[PDB]
Amino acid sequence: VEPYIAYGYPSLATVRAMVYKRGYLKINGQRVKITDNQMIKDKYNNADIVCAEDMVNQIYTCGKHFRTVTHGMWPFKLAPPAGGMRQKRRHFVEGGDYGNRDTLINRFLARMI
Amino acid sequence: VHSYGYKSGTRHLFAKKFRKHGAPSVSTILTNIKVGDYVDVVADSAVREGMPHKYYHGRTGIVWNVTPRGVGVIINKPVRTRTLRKRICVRFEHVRKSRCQEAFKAKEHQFQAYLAAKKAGKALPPLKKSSRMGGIVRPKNVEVLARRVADYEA
Amino acid sequence: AKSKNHTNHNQSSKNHRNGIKGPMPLHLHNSKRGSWLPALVNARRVRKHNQKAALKKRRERIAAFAAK
Amino acid sequence: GVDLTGISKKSRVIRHHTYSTNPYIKLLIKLYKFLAKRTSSGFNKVVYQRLIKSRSNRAPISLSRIAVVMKRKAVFTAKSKAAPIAVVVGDVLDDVRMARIPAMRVCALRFSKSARQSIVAAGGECLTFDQLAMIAPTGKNTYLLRGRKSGRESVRHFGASGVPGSHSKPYATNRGKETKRGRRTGRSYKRKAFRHV
Amino acid sequence: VNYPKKKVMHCGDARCNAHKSFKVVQYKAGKARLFARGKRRYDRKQSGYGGQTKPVFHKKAKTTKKIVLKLQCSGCKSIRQVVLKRTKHFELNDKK
RNA sequence: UACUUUCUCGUACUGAAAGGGAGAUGCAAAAUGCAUCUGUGGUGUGCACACGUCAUUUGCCCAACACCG
RNA sequence: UCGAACCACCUAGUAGCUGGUUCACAUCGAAGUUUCCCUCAGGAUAGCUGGUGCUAGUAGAAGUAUUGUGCGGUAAAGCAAAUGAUUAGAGGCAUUGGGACCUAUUCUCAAACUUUAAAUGUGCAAACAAACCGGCCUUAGCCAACUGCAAGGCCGGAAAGAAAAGAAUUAGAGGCACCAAGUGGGCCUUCUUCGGUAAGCGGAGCAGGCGAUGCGGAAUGAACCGCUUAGGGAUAUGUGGCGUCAAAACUUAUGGGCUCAUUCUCGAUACGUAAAGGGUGUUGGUGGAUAUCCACCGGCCCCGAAAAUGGAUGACGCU
RNA sequence: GGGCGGCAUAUCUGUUACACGACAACGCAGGUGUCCUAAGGCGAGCUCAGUGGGAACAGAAAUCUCACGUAGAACACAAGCGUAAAAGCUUGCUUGAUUAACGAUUUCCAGUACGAAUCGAGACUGCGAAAGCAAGGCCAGCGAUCCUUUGCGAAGAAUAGGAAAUAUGAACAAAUCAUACCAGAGGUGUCAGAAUAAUUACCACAGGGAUAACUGGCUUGUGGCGGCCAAGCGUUCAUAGCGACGUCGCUUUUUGAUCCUUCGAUGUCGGCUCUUCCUAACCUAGCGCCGCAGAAGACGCUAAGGGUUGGAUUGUUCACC
RNA sequence: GAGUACGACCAUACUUGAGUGAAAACACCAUAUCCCGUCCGAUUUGUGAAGUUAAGCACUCACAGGCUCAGUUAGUACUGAGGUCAGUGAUGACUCGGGAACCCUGAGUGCCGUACUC
Numbered sequence A: 001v002e003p004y005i006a007y008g009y010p011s012l013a014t015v016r017a018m019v020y021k022r023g024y025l026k027i028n029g030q031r032v033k034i035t036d037n038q039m040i041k042d043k044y045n046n047a048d049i050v051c052a053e054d055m056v057n058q059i060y061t062c063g064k065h066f067r068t069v070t071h072g073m074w075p076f077k078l079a080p081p082a083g084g085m086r087q088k089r090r091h092f093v094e095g096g097d098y099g100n101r102d103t104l105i106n107r108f109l110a111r112m113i
Numbered sequence B: 001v002h003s004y005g006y007k008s009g010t011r012h013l014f015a016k017k018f019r020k021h022g023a024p025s026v027s028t029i030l031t032n033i034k035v036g037d038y039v040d041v042v043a044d045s046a047v048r049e050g051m052p053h054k055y056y057h058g059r060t061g062i063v064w065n066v067t068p069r070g071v072g073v074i075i076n077k078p079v080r081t082r083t084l085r086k087r088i089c090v091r092f093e094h095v096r097k098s099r100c101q102e103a104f105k106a107k108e109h110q111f112q113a114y115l116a117a118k119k120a121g122k123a124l125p126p127l128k129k130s131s132r133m134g135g136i137v138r139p140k141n142v143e144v145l146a147r148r149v150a151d152y153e154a
Numbered sequence C: 001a002k003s004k005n006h007t008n009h010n011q012s013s014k015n016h017r018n019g020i021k022g023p024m025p026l027h028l029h030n031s032k033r034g035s036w037l038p039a040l041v042n043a044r045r046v047r048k049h050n051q052k053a054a055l056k057k058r059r060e061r062i063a064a065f066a067a068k
Numbered sequence D: 001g002v003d004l005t006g007i008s009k010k011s012r013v014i015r016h017h018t019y020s021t022n023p024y025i026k027l028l029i030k031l032y033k034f035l036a037k038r039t040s041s042g043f044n045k046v047v048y049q050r051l052i053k054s055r056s057n058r059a060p061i062s063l064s065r066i067a068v069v070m071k072r073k074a075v076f077t078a079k080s081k082a083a084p085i086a087v088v089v090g091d092v093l094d095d096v097r098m099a100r101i102p103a104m105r106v107c108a109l110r111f112s113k114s115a116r117q118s119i120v121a122a123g124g125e126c127l128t129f130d131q132l133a134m135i136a137p138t139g140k141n142t143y144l145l146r147g148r149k150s151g152r153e154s155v156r157h158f159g160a161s162g163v164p165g166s167h168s169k170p171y172a173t174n175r176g177k178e179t180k181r182g183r184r185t186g187r188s189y190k191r192k193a194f195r196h197v
Numbered sequence E: 001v002n003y004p005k006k007k008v009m010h011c012g013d014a015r016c017n018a019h020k021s022f023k024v025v026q027y028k029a030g031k032a033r034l035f036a037r038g039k040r041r042y043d044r045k046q047s048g049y050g051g052q053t054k055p056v057f058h059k060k061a062k063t064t065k066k067i068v069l070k071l072q073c074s075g076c077k078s079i080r081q082v083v084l085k086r087t088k089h090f091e092l093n094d095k096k
Numbered sequence F: 001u002a003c004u005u006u007c008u009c010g011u012a013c014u015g016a017a018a019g020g021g022a023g024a025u026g027c028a029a030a031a032u033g034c035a036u037c038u039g040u041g042g043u044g045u046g047c048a049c050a051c052g053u054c055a056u057u058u059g060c061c062c063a064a065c066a067c068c069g
Numbered sequence G: 001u002c003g004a005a006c007c008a009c010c011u012a013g014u015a016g017c018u019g020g021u022u023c024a025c026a027u028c029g030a031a032g033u034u035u036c037c038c039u040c041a042g043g044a045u046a047g048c049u050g051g052u053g054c055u056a057g058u059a060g061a062a063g064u065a066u067u068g069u070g071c072g073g074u075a076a077a078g079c080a081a082a083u084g085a086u087u088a089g090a091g092g093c094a095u096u097g098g099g100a101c102c103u104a105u106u107c108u109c110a111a112a113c114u115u116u117a118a119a120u121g122u123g124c125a126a127a128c129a130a131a132c133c134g135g136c137c138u139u140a141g142c143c144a145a146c147u148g149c150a151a152g153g154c155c156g157g158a159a160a161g162a163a164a165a166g167a168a169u170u171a172g173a174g175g176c177a178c179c180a181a182g183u184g185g186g187c188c189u190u191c192u193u194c195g196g197u198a199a200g201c202g203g204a205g206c207a208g209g210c211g212a213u214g215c216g217g218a219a220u221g222a223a224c225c226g227c228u229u230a231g232g233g234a235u236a237u238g239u240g241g242c243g244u245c246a247a248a249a250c251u252u253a254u255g256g257g258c259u260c261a262u263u264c265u266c267g268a269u270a271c272g273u274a275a276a277g278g279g280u281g282u283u284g285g286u287g288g289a290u291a292u293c294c295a296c297c298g299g300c301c302c303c304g305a306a307a308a309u310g311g312a313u314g315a316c317g318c319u
Numbered sequence H: 001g002g003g004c005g006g007c008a009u010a011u012c013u014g015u016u017a018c019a020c021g022a023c024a025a026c027g028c029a030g031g032u033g034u035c036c037u038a039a040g041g042c043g044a045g046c047u048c049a050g051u052g053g054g055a056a057c058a059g060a061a062a063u064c065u066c067a068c069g070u071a072g073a074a075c076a077c078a079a080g081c082g083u084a085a086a087a088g089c090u091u092g093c094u095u096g097a098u099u100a101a102c103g104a105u106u107u108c109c110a111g112u113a114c115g116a117a118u119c120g121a122g123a124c125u126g127c128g129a130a131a132g133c134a135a136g137g138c139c140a141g142c143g144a145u146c147c148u149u150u151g152c153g154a155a156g157a158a159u160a161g162g163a164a165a166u167a168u169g170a171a172c173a174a175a176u177c178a179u180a181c182c183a184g185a186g187g188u189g190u191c192a193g194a195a196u197a198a199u200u201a202c203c204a205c206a207g208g209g210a211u212a213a214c215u216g217g218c219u220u221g222u223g224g225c226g227g228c229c230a231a232g233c234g235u236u237c238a239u240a241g242c243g244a245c246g247u248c249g250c251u252u253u254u255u256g257a258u259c260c261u262u263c264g265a266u267g268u269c270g271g272c273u274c275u276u277c278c279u280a281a282c283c284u285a286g287c288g289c290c291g292c293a294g295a296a297g298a299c300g301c302u303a304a305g306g307g308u309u310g311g312a313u314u315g316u317u318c319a320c321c
Numbered sequence I: 001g002a003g004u005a006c007g008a009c010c011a012u013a014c015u016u017g018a019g020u021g022a023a024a025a026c027a028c029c030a031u032a033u034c035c036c037g038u039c040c041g042a043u044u045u046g047u048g049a050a051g052u053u054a055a056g057c058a059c060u061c062a063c064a065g066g067c068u069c070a071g072u073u074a075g076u077a078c079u080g081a082g083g084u085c086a087g088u089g090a091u092g093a094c095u096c097g098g099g100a101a102c103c104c105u106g107a108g109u110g111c112c113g114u115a116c117u118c
């Protein structure tokens, strides 16, 4: 599905900006925003994931509960990037935007979060 | 294909492989098929008797019937919006036993190999480390990838 | 006059709206009618013993309740 | 902007209110919608949801059916406990074919005039759902029953009746009319009484 | 298609229940009798003024009819009808 | 409006017709076997409820489905 | 009033054909395909669709991967391997008659040829009605027999609920049923493809679209590009743009080259509707030779290049 | 478009068909309505097509013998598969080409019927020492209700309709007769199945641009007009003027092909009249070039400003004087 | 280290031409009264035991043909996804992946099972 997606390798600040600013949770089948770590601890019920730094831990360093944290959250809905996109219709190597960025995806997401 | 008979478009399909001709072998007769077993219907011309239809040639399903020279086998055929289960009946040369569950009976018997070394003894084969970790590279040979001029003259 | 003969265009998109309904499991509708008959008549002899064993086991489970 | 393709097909039909015009069913729906939310009992969940259901989906039970399944539970009941209160959301009819029955305590949505008599003549008791909300208000020591929906005429007509496997009944006011072609092997074919799956 | 005038077959009649000699005649249809039920109905429908009242088939396409052999057993003289395929010429002869 | 009586549909189907006509269990094997009459024909899956356990084990299984008798 | 008068009637004859069919909002939302039909402007049928639900809310889930294990003969390859074609030289010398024949090679091919053989696909399995491990009961199943085999139960055991090796993921409630609409003229497109000289032609395959749907862009365009649509704001984008029309480089750079064209007037937004050939116009390259020649190759520009209302990179214009 | 022609109307192998399966066209290449008492069934023995060496008459070919021979033969037939102590050939005995309790299934598919086929169980058998194989010749070769018609339901038992005797003609009974239930047959090739000749220019109705004749559109085979290459023509010589074999194209004043628009109507030829446009220039204005001495003229360039007739015949465009 | 009988995979086992072969066994070989079958005691059937490893069989050897297996061909041909890519077009490259085939070259030239025997 490469013509439809732009992927890459996140940093620690890309994870914690996405979890804090635009990270929400699937609580009672509803999309509620992370406001306190009590609401995270009430969601996962794992005694290893009790705060918002537990979720950026399991995401950034995979851990035993990468799936339960990411299936815990709603899909992140970002803004379009400020400053634009170069070409949607071509790969990143061809001079456009889709495909893999071997850690360059951080500056592209830093214009969206 | 201008005709809709039973063997139509089966020119290359019901043929035999090059220097693989002949009547079926004795290890096909001795291979005993049991009800409830996954078999693998592959139509064997040089028998020409009790062949499956051309649809059931790569297919593999469960035996439900064993008669003296016949095997019934339940094979899924998707029709419009549903996958109904066709119970065909072939001669016994047109089935092979299926090795589909070979990799599952292998890690099942590895789970009685383990649990027979944990509860009683202690001797285990070690767990395998991933090759995707970050090691150091000791270069025993280096080249230069450079696209020489003489690479074009061919 | 002449029209369009045969097409398979929309059909695969029509077939997946209510899904391709998958096959059903092997414990549903596993009728042995039409199977090889000497082994079918044998298995009836056995099920008529397994039913009267089930009538006797449940009756024996009641006397192990009225005494305890 | 969301790619929600098969998302209306995941929806189901629930119908939280009743279609009935009876003012006494609406009082039980006033009572059991209260108990369904204000109690952790799964009894009041099921008794509220089965009370909403239509009159076709509240198929009635027979008194000889209550007398057999209460027998097969009182077989493995310790005899220090009494017996459950049989509760059906629907009608109890009498059964001619079962003369003597034990003293059972039945809560139904309506009884016959004769099913009421044969319960109380056996030493039993016909209850009602306002009276079941007082003794066992959460359904402790009850036995919830339904009543049979197969065996109906309409269910016996559901099907094609001329494709193989189908033994449904044709819609025919004349019984000896649709009995010839496609129903006897001598009259060019007869639909196959059995088909696998 | 040559066919023998004798044929050894099963007879299934509990006086036989065994392979016995049959003899072969051929099936030729009997004369359509008046005072059959559908013939009396047809004579009642035709009488009057409407003309011809049932369809009368013209467009014959078969040039050939199926062969039915009546097989009378030697033991118990009981006919058994069997059918053979469509052939244009059929003959019974003992010559081989 | 109030009130009162055979006819019809249904409780039993099947066969072309003459016709025949469906409970369970136990003993048991009699070309109408005998005795009981508080009873799901049996097995798999299966709301509620009854007794334990953990952060479901089991009993009965209602409605239902499948496989049989 | 005549190739069958006029009047009343039967008669509001019948029409698979044409025309019409009267309020609002909301929730969902298609089909031009299958099979049969004196059927091809129509139906019945399955499908897509709505309504009603029912059943124990993750269950018997999947237009997807991964690992294991099967199926294939299309693209390519080959003719130095069979069959079908098809050029040409080499001599074998007795195997012959006015290249036959043989042996090794060769030039060139195959929708109805093939040794081999992809990519894309396609089947099954991947632990909760299940398989796994040690007795028992039953069977007029199998075998000489049972202690073996096959079958259906019963009893007890174990159970990373599936390890580690990249070792899945899911806006993943599963399974049933009733009732019934509209449709059954399609059309366009990337790719594969058939008939045709061709076609805005005819017919197919996989998918996506229009039909039925606007909106933002390509000046204009059912179908292209972007995006998909409750009533409104703010910010930021996408496709496409930034000399004026016309929002934006008040004609941006403190970037590089190339280009000159004199009566449908160089050129210039894809889809989208001029070639062979030529040039001592200019600007780069390559290989040879003695500051000058020679053979080649590319970029832009010119020639090749002729139609019927006045005319069109959208207009002005731009060098 | 319809008509003629045809069959793509029921159906079979190869290909189209895009390595599961499924896929269209009056797409390509051929078949089908029959044939067989053996050309079925089975057992035994054998090896085929062809070539090579040999043997009176006897040759390329008659028949004997030997060798090699993966099938190059054969299997009734179209084709494809398959096959060598065989599936072929010869021989020997045979009738499994019968019956087959309404078993189940596949292909076509609506998961209906039909046709064909597969895996069974039961009776009686055939061949074989046996294991086995055989209920046609694999795979195409065929057909509803209604009606006609045939076969089976031997007689002989039964104090009684049953475990066992086919049944009815309805107030009874006998004997005829008809009927019923079961399995076939006689047929519908338009092959899921009405019993069917034209004509209409005297014509009609409901419709259709789902569909033809006129224009327009697309295409440009065909018809008009060129360029490129240069074998040749021109006494000499490629090009003054031409230019085969090829080749690349322009043109929409022809015609074909299509079926987009119009069938609740776009008045369907040619003259006559009148105006304008285009250039691929016949005359006129400038020219270049010649196999251009002059005179006439060939070829070409810039140019469409202006001019481009009177008649005989023909309805004519055209043609022809 | 071999034989024989039954064998499983079915050429790494085949084809051609040489070479060698202890024992024992296979095998040619001898024969025609019975059993049996032929134009023919050839095959086949019976009954044998004088002879020979000539041949079969076995093994070994060929700049043998074949077969088998890697390698090369070759990241080549081809192909899945992409573009308001390039080119009048034919078609080509690029980008994210998958990835052949013959020729050619090297290797070696059967392997496993049961019973009986030397």
Ligand SMILES: *O[C@H]1[C@H](O)[C@@H](N)[C@@H](O[C@H]2[C@H](O[C@@H]3O[C@H](CO)[C@@H](O[C@H]4O[C@@H](CN)[C@@H](O)[C@H](O)[C@H]4N)[C@H]3O)[C@@H](O)[C@H](N)C[C@@H]2N)O[C@@H]1CO
Pocket (backbone or CB within 6 Å): C018, C021, D008, D009, D010, D011, D012, D013, G050, G176, G177
């Ligand atoms: O009974 C059958 C059922 O009718 C049929 N749909 C299917 O069930 C599927 C199931 O499909 C859903 O069934 C729902 C209704 O039956 C339907 O939901 C949608 O239906 C429309 C109207 N009926 C809409 O109004 C609405 O969008 C929505 N309710 C289907 O989504 C699937 O969800 C399951 N995955 C599989 C079932 N097989 O099959 C039944 C079997 O008889």
Ligand SMILES: NC[C@@H]1O[C@H](O[C@H]2[C@@H](O)[C@H](O[C@@H]3[C@@H](O)[C@H](N)C[C@H](N)[C@H]3O[C@H]3O[C@H](CO)[C@@H](O)[C@H](O)[C@H]3N)O[C@@H]2CO)[C@H](N)[C@@H](O)[C@@H]1O
Pocket (backbone or CB within 6 Å): D148, D150, D151, F040
């Ligand atoms: N067999 C176990 C028991 O079956 C019961 O149900 C049994 C019967 O009550 C029930 O029979 C019903 C009958 O009640 C009702 N009046 C009519 C209905 N058609 C029958 O149903 C059954 O009978 C017909 C007979 O042909 C079958 O075709 C059908 O498949 C089957 N569902 O079906 C089962 C017969 O095998 C209950 N589910 C329960 O008490 C218990 O599980």
Ligand SMILES: [Mg+2]
Pocket (backbone or CB within 6 Å): none
């Ligand atoms: Mg009834």
Ligand SMILES: [Mg+2]
Pocket (backbone or CB within 6 Å): none
């Ligand atoms: Mg759109």
Ligand SMILES: [Mg+2]
Pocket (backbone or CB within 6 Å): H147, H148
């Ligand atoms: Mg008749």
